[PDB]
Ligand binder design. Structure first.
Ligand code: MG
Ligand code: ZN
Lengths: 172, 83, 49, 726, 585, 21
DNA sequence: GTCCTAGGACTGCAATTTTAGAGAGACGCGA
DNA sequence: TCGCGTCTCTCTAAAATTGCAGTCCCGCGCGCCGTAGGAC
RNA sequence: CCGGCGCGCG
């Protein structure tokens, strides 16, 4: 059944559409169901004009961000204590289990390493993120991490800022 | 005769162009750190604490809006914008 | 606001408030070093990416 | 319009007559018939107007409701504006009566200002003559735009919404697509314009015993619509009580209730009351989602008249009204007898009055669509005044006929109906099923085959006819919002065929029904097959479930079984899965594993097609100022690489593809000429290294604001500053 | 690694009247544009051939208008906050009155001595200054020293700006800021004005800009070929400037200033001045700013040559890296390459003959087109390019008809369906662009989306339903047998598929497949349902989906998988794809 | 959330390695 | 006939428009 | 003989509205209509 | 080869 519809000013119509499209809507039900039909077309005219403006401002603010260095030399690292966030990040510090080093500084975080951290009692993970790079006009390979599409570490000269802007504005 | 009284995309755009706790913590932190620490540790530590907290909440608010609609965007792309 | 406080006046002029950006910049002889992607698009040159 | 559907042009007809009645006198505070004939005004590009005695010329409205200025048909559309702000009781409608009288106010403060009103006013528009459906629906539009009206930016978000005062006056489905959504309305079938500028719809009054009530059909302005309890249900319900306390849905005070029959004042009894002409031509509309009803109405207005027309097996019964009110067929103006018929004319004689009626033969519309007329009567036939005499284009037997009945299957076929593609048979091509005549005009020997290739048919202005058979890339659609592009044409031996051995003509993707939620096309295809076997046509009013539950299912299933039993075709109705049958692969002869819904629906051919959209460009003419390639297919222009396309190239990192389309494919005058030369000799294209004419154009403009912009190169070798020429 | 240093810059700057003259040197003196009869450029007019050049240089050669009186630049006076007002440190109202009303400024200059106690901006005219002082001081000498104690209009502004001491401004602003600080809404705004004033004065010292250039002495004139509206505004400046010099009166001085402001920037003075049609004029600021302006329409996006357009239809037989091009679009886009192919094999005498042959649609033109399209990629692009996968590169092939054939698996990236969508085609010309398109933009290296990394060319809809039906296993339990139960054995998968072809078994009929590989069948981690142990040593372990035969005497191990033809077909399809790709390389 | 107490916040940035002596 | 012919919607921000705060020179009444 | 609240402005510190400035998806197709006014 | 108005398609 099509359920209940809503009038333009928020409130719900005190009459249900108890029939489905196979049974055939009554004349009263068809008129009520036209309320949501009008909303869909009108909301389309604002979903595009707003997301398009949002995308342009998103790309504009980071258009100049390009991978220009292999390593800025930073020592800062965001502390992490979910899995999909940690994959592809570069460790900012060594990780130890007892007296054994299980993960080294400046090493890409695979999912096997992450599972090993979760399997044992590892509380703090220090990673290099865009927040830790020693620049706001460019980013380095290690602070960005693995390429979003090429699997390996990101390559020099990649316009990651425009890709970042397009990735957010696209589903708008 | 009688009167009764009874009980997305705009959200993400508002955050980008600028949480109730975030603005209440920034107000609280501003008036205290400078009074405790003087020469730049008053300003350096205060700015560091405010910016670190802002980045965490700015990414969380944007990610929460997109996750509510099933949109899957990596944290890297948002951290590029927030930076 | 962040996009209007960049290191390039060509990027700001082609973004918003072109007259305001150009008037403020031309008063101080502002120099754009074309380090960004959009600056080289305006000139028709090769982007540094 | 108390007991019948009113004329679709009655609002324009009544408005113009009122303007002649009181509008002329109220503004002058004597007309003679025009010397030029209506056909002569358009033939040699004049204005159909009458003389006012010598004050000026007053344009005259055709019986179809359209004016002629400079030989161009024009329509004056209605406007809505402020008289709960969105309540229709606080609005007014300005017809052609108000627009023509108002211009008389400006005229007297005639011939020139009326000429400039039709040319320039937004509310005066060129009549759309694609098909008979477009001719009538254009005149019934309601607009919030125009002078004195809100703009799309000005439009409030609470406007563009459906208000409950619109029920019976403004169609809740029909609206414009794009920025103007919710601002372009459409009148309902039974709507009428009142004396206070308000819209009225007829309702049936239920009144007590002690009252004469000679006529129980009375029209409501939206102001008095609120204070009546109006029911849309029926009285086919009885329990151990009596009929008066049976409950029905009703409308009162902008909300929906459920009260007893004894508390109901008015009844909505007309079937087409709440819809416009476009939505009233969709059979089984109650099984289609209202979202697709809006698109279906638009698609029906793009249907191309075919060289041969045929009626739909399944319809709604409004096709006859559309044909009569469009003026496309020939309607007798006098009773009598038919004495002579041919292609060029029809002779009718009655009561010592003999008239000769010329017939349209291969004439051009404003949309490059052909018009043609064929006699519908024989010699010696008695005719009443107002009865049909001939059939026009897209009109058969006095009914609107925009499409064809073709055999159709709903199954996936090797990806050639992926998404919205349509696979058709060669029979539709060599049978001339979807062949249409198209005529352009250009401002040469008659009957010559020019080489836009076509045959020159009329020289006055050169008219060239083009016979366009169906092709890959053409657009076809049904009356349920089911559109599709033709992507493959197969020989008849390759198409799937039925248990009677007949191959189908089209194959549709079944995946397009659930997402689009238009079940009415499944109902129509099954009933179209039954009607073709039974030699029957069906004209079904919408919302037939008011009689009983699953009324459309009972009608389709029982008619399917009647066709199966009478013609001895057990596959037509299958008790295991009614409406579906096992069909066979034309390539292997093996049956498909699942039964397939088959039928004979009504499919239209739309104007959007190839031969009007394929464009290509190597080089050529550029703009004078920007020196960039022109814009438009007609100007042999190029394709724009917008800023969003530049972002994608920057995301790919293709810095040399971007520079190609920024300098020497667009505006680098020096480098455009060298690329033309190197590619013909194949000798490597070098980098431009200079500035394109768009940057030099910007520098000069900044110079005009007393600003200097210089480009400097600093050598990394000796640090010498080089000034680039700009 | 030493970076390949590239030091390129561009700088805007306020221009000087001398540089305006150097641009023009060439002065436009008459407002006539063209001859009414001969349609020739009027001499000394807006389109003068002597000033601008013969009828290329007309796109770049500039002119100038010698204004009798200086006029202020609207951008630097009327825009908020006013730069002239801040540098002169006066309220905007009094400056606007001095420029637009009949106001005279007292003591406009300082570097020359005066002898009067006139200070401020006296709105009323000084009664003594009208007759007494001029009549005692005569006319010549009085006018000689006139413009040193009282002046009016933009000339007074320019005089105030010319003699400004910027360092004194900085020092006074700093000392006033300190005084204000050492002492609460505009107690701060006055400070903010002071900070803004020293930063404004500081920038003038280090640059070559002069604050008096903010008032214009000459008016540069746009080249004629860039204005084939703007012309009408240029006539007005000449219309009212040439009137002013005829007089040499205050009203005409204001009219010239308003003409320049309207030409420079309309819609800034409240009511913007309209034309005779009651339509607002378009100024240079309007044409350089906005979404339709020069920056966002002409520079950020361009129309290009060697491009086409047509309707999109689906081709399921295409490869993932191929597209179908209409013959007309292909012959248009590759016209130069077809000309080269014709001339190279001596089938065309020259370029004109080759073009004529192409125009006649000779049968040999299509052979050369087909030859030259091999190995030359093209770029397809749908209209709303939301991400970088909205434009991709394909290998074009010649297809019949007038539509572009598109692979079904790349529609999701393009967000394209075949209900009326169209696409643009572009041809990379140079070798570097072709290499970029081949090695970076082809669909076979772009299988992942950059947003999160999911695959983008994944089977959808019809293919998904086909795979789902193929891999939907047997009917089981009460859906397979009417009663409580109180299948063929195939040596290899080829035997099972062959039996399926001969209609011996159905697509979902159960069968047992002999397995000669390791146990690699995905199934629930469950113990055998039944173990049939024989006294001779052999035992049979019966699982839900396979049977395993083991023995205690030998090390033999036989595996039989209970499956259908559909699962076998899916596995064979993927396996054969891998093996065929390996063998082909 | 970093606690609103300035010294608790300092201890937090010490623990999260935001800032240290 | 015409030939030259001269009215959304939201945010940002400086600009009035007061409101107020104190406050003092000359003073009519007054000690 | 001055002294006292204080009459009559008086000049500016501090919010309180308030009138602009700025902006508001992309890419295609088609048609119509301009270029006006007045003494001959 | 210039701009406005109207109607459309994705
Ligand atoms: Mg589509
Ligand atoms: Zn870094």
């Amino acid at each position: 059944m099509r359920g209940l519809m809503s009038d333009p000013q928020g409130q719900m119509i005190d009459l249900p559409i108890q029939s489905n499209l196979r049974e055939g809507l009554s004349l009263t039900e068809y008129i009520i169901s036209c309320y949501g039909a009008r909303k869909g077309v009108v909301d389309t005219a604002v979903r595009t004009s707003d997301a398009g403006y949002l995308t342009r401002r998103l790309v504009e603010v980071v258009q100049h961000i390009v991978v220009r260095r292999t390593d800025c030399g930073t020592i800062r690292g965001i502390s992490v204590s979910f899995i999909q966030t940690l994959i592809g990040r570069v460790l900012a510090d060594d990780i130890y289990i007892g007296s054994r080093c299980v993960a080294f500084r400046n090493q890409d975080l695979g999912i096997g390493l992450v599972n090993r951290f979760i399997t044992f009692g590892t509380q703090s993970i220090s990673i290099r993120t865009p927040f830790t790079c020693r620049s706001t006009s460019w980013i380095c390979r290690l602070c960005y991490g693995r390429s979003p599409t090429h699997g390996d570490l990101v390559e020099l000269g990649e316009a990651v800022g425009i890709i970042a802007g397009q990735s957010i504005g696209e589903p708008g | 005769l009688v009167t009764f009284i009874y009980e997305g995309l705009p959200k993400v755009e508002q955050v980008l162009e600028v949480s109730l706790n975030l603005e209440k913590r920034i107000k609280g932190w501003n008036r205290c750190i400078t009074r405790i620490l003087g020469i730049p540790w008053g300003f350096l530590i205060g700015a560091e604490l405010t910016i670190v907290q802002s980045r965490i909440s700015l990414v969380n608010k944007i990610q929460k809006v997109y996750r509510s609609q099933g949109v899957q965007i990596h944290n890297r792309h948002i951290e590029i914008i927030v930076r | 606001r962040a996009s209007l406080n960049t290191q390039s006046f060509i990027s700001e002029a082609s973004f918003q408030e072109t007259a305001r950006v150009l008037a403020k910049a031309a008063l101080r002889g502002r120099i754009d070093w074309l380090k960004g992607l959009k600056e080289n698009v305006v000139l028709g040159g090769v982007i540094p990416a | 319009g108390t007991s019948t559907i009113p004329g679709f042009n009655q609002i324009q007809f009544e408005g113009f007559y009122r303007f002649i009645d009181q509008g002329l006198i109220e503004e002058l505070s004597q007309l003679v018939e025009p010397l030029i004939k209506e056909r002569d005004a358009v033939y040699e590009s004049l204005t159909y107007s009458s003389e006012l005695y010598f004050i000026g010329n007053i344009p005259l409205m055709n019986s179809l409701g359209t004016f002629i200025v400079n030989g161009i048909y024009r329509v004056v559309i209605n406007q809505i504006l402020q008289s709960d702000m969105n309540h229709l009781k606080n609005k007014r409608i300005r017809s052609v009566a108000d627009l023509l009288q108002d211009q008389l106010g400006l005229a007297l403060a005639l011939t020139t200002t009326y000429e400039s009103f039709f040319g320039l006013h937004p509310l005066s528009q060129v009549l759309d003559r694609t098909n008979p459906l477009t001719q009538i629906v254009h005149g019934r539009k309601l607009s919030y735009l125009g002078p004195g009206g809100l703009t799309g930016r000005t439009a409030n978000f609470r406007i563009r919404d459906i208000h409950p005062s619109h029920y019976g006056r403004i169609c809740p489905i029909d609206t414009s697509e794009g920025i103007n959504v919710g601002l372009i309305g459409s009148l309902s079938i039974h709507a009428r314009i009142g004396d206070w500028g308000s819209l009225e719809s007829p309702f049936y009054e239920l009144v007590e015993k002690s009252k004469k009530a000679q006529i129980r059909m009375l029209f409501l302005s939206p102001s008095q619509d609120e204070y009546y309890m109006i029911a849309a249900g029926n009285s086919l319900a009885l329990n151990r009580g009596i009929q008066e306390e049976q409950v029905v849905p009703a409308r009162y005070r902008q909300e929906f209730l459920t009260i007893a029959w004894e508390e109901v004042h008015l009844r909505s009894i007309f079937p087409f009351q709440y819809f416009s002409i476009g939505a009233s031509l969709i059979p089984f509309i109650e099984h289609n989602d209202a979202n697709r009803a809006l698109m279906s109405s638009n698609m029906q207005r793009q249907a191309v008249p075919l060289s041969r027309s045929e009626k739909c097996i399944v319809g709604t019964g409004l096709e006859r009204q559309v044909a009569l009110d469009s003026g496309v067929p020939a309607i007798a103006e006098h009773e009598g007898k038919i004495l002579y018929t041919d292609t060029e004319k029809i002779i009718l004689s009655g009561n010592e009055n003999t008239l000769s009626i010329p017939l349209i033969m291969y004439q051009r519309s404003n949309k490059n669509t052909c018009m043609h007329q064929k006699p519908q009567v024989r010699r010696g036939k008695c005719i009443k005044k107002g009865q049909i005499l001939a059939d026009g284009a897209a009109t058969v037997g006095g009914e609107l006929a925009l499409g064809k009945n073709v055999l159709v299957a709903y199954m996936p076929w090797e990806g050639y109906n992926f998404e919205d593609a349509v696979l058709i048979s060669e029979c539709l091509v060599y049978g001339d099923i979807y062949t249409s005549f198209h005529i352009r005009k250009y401002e040469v020997m008659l009957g010559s085959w020019v080489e836009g290739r076509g045959r020159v048919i009329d020289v006055r202005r050169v008219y060239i006819s083009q016979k366009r058979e169906i092709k890959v890339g053409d657009k076809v659609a049904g009356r349920h919002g089911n559109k599709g592009i033709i992507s493959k044409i197969l020989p008849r031996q390759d198409m799937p065929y039925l248990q009677d051995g007949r191959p189908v003509d089209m194959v549709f993707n079944p995946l397009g029904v659930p997402s689009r939620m238009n079940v009415g096309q499944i109902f129509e295809c099954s009933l179209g097959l039954a009607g073709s076997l039974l030699d029957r046509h069906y004209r079904i009013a919408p919302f037939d479930e008011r009689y009983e539950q699953e009324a459309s299912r009972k009608l389709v299933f029982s008619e399917l079984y009647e066709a199966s039993k009478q013609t001895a075709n057990p596959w037509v109705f299958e008790p295991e899965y009614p409406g579906k049958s096992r069909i066979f692969d034309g390539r292997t002869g093996d049956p498909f594993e699942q039964p397939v819904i088959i039928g004979k629906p009504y499919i239209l051919k739309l104007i959007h097609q190839v031969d009007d959209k394929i464009h290509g460009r190597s080089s050529g003419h550029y703009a004078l100022v920007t020196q960039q390639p022109l814009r438009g297919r007609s100007k042999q222009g190029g394709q724009r690489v917008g800023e969003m396309e530049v972002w994608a190239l920057e995301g790919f990192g293709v810095a040399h593809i971007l520079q190609e389309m920024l300098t020497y494919k667009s505006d680098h005058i020096r480098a455009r000429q060298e690329v033309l030369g190197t590619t013909i000799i194949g000798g490597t294209i070098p980098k431009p290294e200079d500035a394109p004419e768009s940057f030099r154009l910007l520098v000069r403009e900044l110079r005009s604001l007393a600003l200097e912009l210089n480009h400097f190169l600093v050598s990394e070798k000796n640090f010498q500053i080089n000034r680039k020429e700009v | 690694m030493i970076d390949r240093y590239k030091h390129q810059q561009l700088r805007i700057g306020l221009v000087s009247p001398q540089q305006i003259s150097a641009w023009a040197t060439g002065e436009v003196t008459k407002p006539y544009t063209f001859h009414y009869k001969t349609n020739k450029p009027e001499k000394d007019g807006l389109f003068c051939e002597r000033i601008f050049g013969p009828i290329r240089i007309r796109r770049y050669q500039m002119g100038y208008i010698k204004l009798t009186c200086p006029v202020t630049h609207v951008w630097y006076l009327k825009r908020l906050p006013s730069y002239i007002a801040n540098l002169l440190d006066k309220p905007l109202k009094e400056l606007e009155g001095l420029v637009y009303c009949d106001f005279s400024f007292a003591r406009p200059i300082t570097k020359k001595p005066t002898f009067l106690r006139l200070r401020g901006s006296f709105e009323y005219e000084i009664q003594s200054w009208k007759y007494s002082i001029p009549l005692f001081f005569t006319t010549q000498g009085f006018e000689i020293f006139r413009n040193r104690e009282i002046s009016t209009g933009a000339g007074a502004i320019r005089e105030q700006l010319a003699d400004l001491d910027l360092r004194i401004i900085i020092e006074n602003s700093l000392v006033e800021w300190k005084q204000l600080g050492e002492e609460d809404r505009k107690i701060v705004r006055r400070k903010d004005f002071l900070v803004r004033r020293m930063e404004l004065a500081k920038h003038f010292i280090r640059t070559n800009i002069e604050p008096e250039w903010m008032v214009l002495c000459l008016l540069p004139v746009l080249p004629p070929e860039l204005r084939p509206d703007i012309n009408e505004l240029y006539r007005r400046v000449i219309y009212r400037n040439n009137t002013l010099t005829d007089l040499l009166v205050m009203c005409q001085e204001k009219l010239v200033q308003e003409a320049v402001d309207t030409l420079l920037d309309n819609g800034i003075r409240g009511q913007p001045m309209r034309d005779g049609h009651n339509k607002v004029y378009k100024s240079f600021s309007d044409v350089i700013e906005g979404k339709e302006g020069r920056f966002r329409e002409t520079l950020l996006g361009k129309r290009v040559d060697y491009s086409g357009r047509s309707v999109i239809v689906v081709g399921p037989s295409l490869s993932l890296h191929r597209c179908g091009l209409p013959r007309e679009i292909a012959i248009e886009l590759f016209q130069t390459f077809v000309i080269r192919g014709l001339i190279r094999q001596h089938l065309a005498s020259n370029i004109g003959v080759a073009k004529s042959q192409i125009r006649e649609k000779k049968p040999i033109v299509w052979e050369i087109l087909q030859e030259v399209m091999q190995g030359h990629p093209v770029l397809l692009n749908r209209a709303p390019t939301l991400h970088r996968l909205g434009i991709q590169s394909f290998q074009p092939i010649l297809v019949e008809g007038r539509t572009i054939c598109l692979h079904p698996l790349v529609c999701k990236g393009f967000n394209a369906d075949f209900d009326g969508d169209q696409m643009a085609v572009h041809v990379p010309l140079s070798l570097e662009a072709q290499a970029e398109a081949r090695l970076l933009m082809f669909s076979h290296m772009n299988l992942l989306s950059p947003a999160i990394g999911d695959p983008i060319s994944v089977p959808t809809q019809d293919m998904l339903i086909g795979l789902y039906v193929l891999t939907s296993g047997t009917r089981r339990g009460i859906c397979a047998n009417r009663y409580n139960p109180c299948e063929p054995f195939f040596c290899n998968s080829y035997d099972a598929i062959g039996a399926y072809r001969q209609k011996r078994i159905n697509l979902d009929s159960p069968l047992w497949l002999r397995w000669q590989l390791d146990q690699r069948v995905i199934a629930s981690k469950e113990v055998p349902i039944e173990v049939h142990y024989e006294s001779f040593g052999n035992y049979h372990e019966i699982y839900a989906h396979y049977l395993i035969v083991r023995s205690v005497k030998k090390e033999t191990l036989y595996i039989y998988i209970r499956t259908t033809v559909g699962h076998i077909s899916f596995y064979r399809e993927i396996e054969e794809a891998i093996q065929g790709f390996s063998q082909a390389c | 959330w970093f606690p609103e107490e300035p010294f608790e916040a300092f201890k937090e940035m010490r623990e999260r390695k935001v800032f240290d002596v």
